[PDB]
Every structure is written in structure tokens, then in C-alpha cells.
Amino acid sequence: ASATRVIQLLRNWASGRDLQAKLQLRYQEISKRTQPPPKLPVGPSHKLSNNYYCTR
């Protein structure tokens, strides 16, 4: 946050906690909106043998 030192000290005193530690507005700490592709593993029934549907 672009809050001056005096305003920060005043707001932390009025509230009673350290506010800059836990801010309400989201900043660069969040993840990117463009991500690598996934691979998404397949389930247990994707076998080639010993996989008859009458057993599952």
C-alpha cells in the first residue's frame, strides 16, 4: 500500500493491530493469470489388461 508512515502509524494505533502485515487488497503476491498447461493424471481404471467392467 502507498500509505505514508504517519498514516500507517495512526491507523495501526487506532485499530490496535499491525495492518501492513495482513492487508485487505491483493497485490503482486497472487498467482499469474497465465499458467503452464496441466497433465491431469488418469484414474485407476485406465489399465489395458485385467480390467473387465464386470469386476468394477
Binding site: 489399465k47 489395458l48 489388461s49 485385467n50
Partner: protein, 215 residues
């Protein structure tokens, strides 16, 4: 059969007990053996029923090419029957019951031998391709599954496949065998079963070499 009909009159003229003397019990009589493949002297000869396979090849066929140590595999009863390795064909007789005990069956007693200087997977693939070319296509198991097996088999020679496929191929045969109209489905499933059961490590090795070469 032609052989059965042709031998019936001699059985009548000489007696049934004389013909029953040869061979073991429930395996009586003489048999025509067509020994072909990697033998010095491929030949058709008549012999008593329960001859040891090695004795028959050593006497009548002139010995396997390259000596007995060169032997790799033998298909005793024609393309339909499963193949057997050198370990069990050392002391195996040639009749119905004993060959069934070898998981093969006597079949037509048409012996095809292959030494160790040949691609066994290629031979089994050719057999499967023949069976694909010879099925009438009436019922869906034989038709579709035998074509399907042939495609899988062709890749196996190349090794273009994976280790998981080998198990899958086995189940495919379980779906062909016993579910068709006639026994051509059984005769097409059994060679694959025998080749897998007795040379799975060879298929694994070929697959590994293909995976290494193609990265």
C-alpha cells in the same frame, strides 16, 4: 480325412488289434509326419505314433540345421498348435495326450522347426497374417479380433508397442478362443498364446531396443 479313409481298408484287412498294437493306449497306430523348416532333409515319412520328437528328427529329417544346439523352437502340429521351446521338445513324445500335456496338442503332426538364427516373432506374425487372410468373416470374434491381433502382431515385430500391450494381447486371445462359430478362431488364438507364454522376454527386449533407438 484322407488319411483316415485311406488307412481304414488296411485296418480291416490286417485286423484292428494289429493297428492297435502300435503307440500307447488311446494313441494307437501309425502317423504321417511332415518335417519341414530348419532341417537338413525336410521330408514326409510314416512312423509309429509315440516317437520322441528328437529321435524322429534325428533319424528321418537328417538333423536340425546347425546341429541340435542350434534348435530354438518347434511347432509340432501345424500352424494351429502352440509352439514349444527346446527345453520341452528334448523328451516329448508325438501323440494326442502327451502333446496336450505340453500345452500344444498333436494336430496334424506337421512339424515346423526353427533354429536360433531366425526371427520367431516374425514367423508367428506371418502365421497370424495367414489366419487373417483365411478367415471367412462370418462371426464378429474371428473376423474383427483376428484382424486386430494381426495389427498388434505386426507392431510387435517392429517393437513399436509397449509391455502393457503383451498382457492385453493375451486377453484378446481369451476373447477369440471358445467364442467363435468354428475352430479357426481357436487356431488363430493359440499361436499367439504359445509365443507369448514361451518368449515374453524376447518381446520385452525388442520393445526396449525400439524405445532406445527411437528415443
Amino acid at each position: 480325412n484322407v488319411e483316415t479313409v485311406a488307412v481304414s481298408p488296411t485296418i480291416c484287412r490286417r485286423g484292428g488289434a494289429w493297428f492297435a498294437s502300435f503307440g500307447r493306449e488311446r494313441n494307437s497306430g501309425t502317423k504321417l509326419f511332415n518335417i519341414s523348416g530348419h532341417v537338413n532333409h525336410p521330408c514326409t515319412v510314416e512312423e509309429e505314433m509315440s516317437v520322441p520328437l528328437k529321435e524322429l528328427i534325428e533319424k528321418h529329417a537328417g538333423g536340425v540345421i546347425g546341429g541340435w544346439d542350434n534348435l530354438l523352437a518347434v511347432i509340432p502340429g501345424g500352424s494351429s498348435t502352440p509352439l514349444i521351446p527346446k527345453s520341452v521338445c528334448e523328451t516329448v513324445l508325438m501323440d494326442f495326450d502327451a502333446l496336450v500335456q505340453a500345452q500344444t496338442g498333436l494336430g496334424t503332426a506337421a512339424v515346423i522347426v526353427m533354429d536360433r538364427s531366425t526371427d520367431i516373432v516374425k514367423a508367428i506374425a506371418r502365421l497370424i497374417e495367414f489366419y487373417k487372410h483365411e478367415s471367412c468373416g462370418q462371426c464378429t470374434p474371428c473376423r474383427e479380433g483376428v484382424d486386430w491381433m494381426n495389427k498388434v502382431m505386426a507392431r510387435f515385430v517392429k517393437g513399436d508397442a509397449r509391455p502393457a500391450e503383451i498382457d492385453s494381447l493375451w486377453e484378446i486371445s481369451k476373447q477369440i478362443e471358445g467364442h467363435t462359430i468354428c475352430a479357426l478362431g481357436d487356431g488363430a488364438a493359440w499361436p499367439v498364446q504359445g509365443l507369448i507364454r514361451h518368449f515374453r522376454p524376447e518381446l520385452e527386449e525388442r520393445m526396449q531396443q525400439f524405445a532406445l533407438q527411437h528415443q
